[PDB]
Amino acid sequence: MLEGKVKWFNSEKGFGFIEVEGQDDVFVHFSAIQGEGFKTLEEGQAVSFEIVEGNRGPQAANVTKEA
């Protein structure tokens, strides 16, 4: 898994960006977020994830909120 931090998340529309030191930001949609219920992320949150080729370039997958 890669380790990063949520750069941006649009709480309303369910997407954002994960920043990874020395790498390009990675796009995250709510559907990638693991866990039950409403799926969301706050800026600054540490996450673990992988990158997948979506329809339109790389996107985050299997995103988990870390301490």
Next chain:
DNA sequence: TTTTT
């Protein structure tokens, strides 16, 4: 559902 082509 992009900072997507």
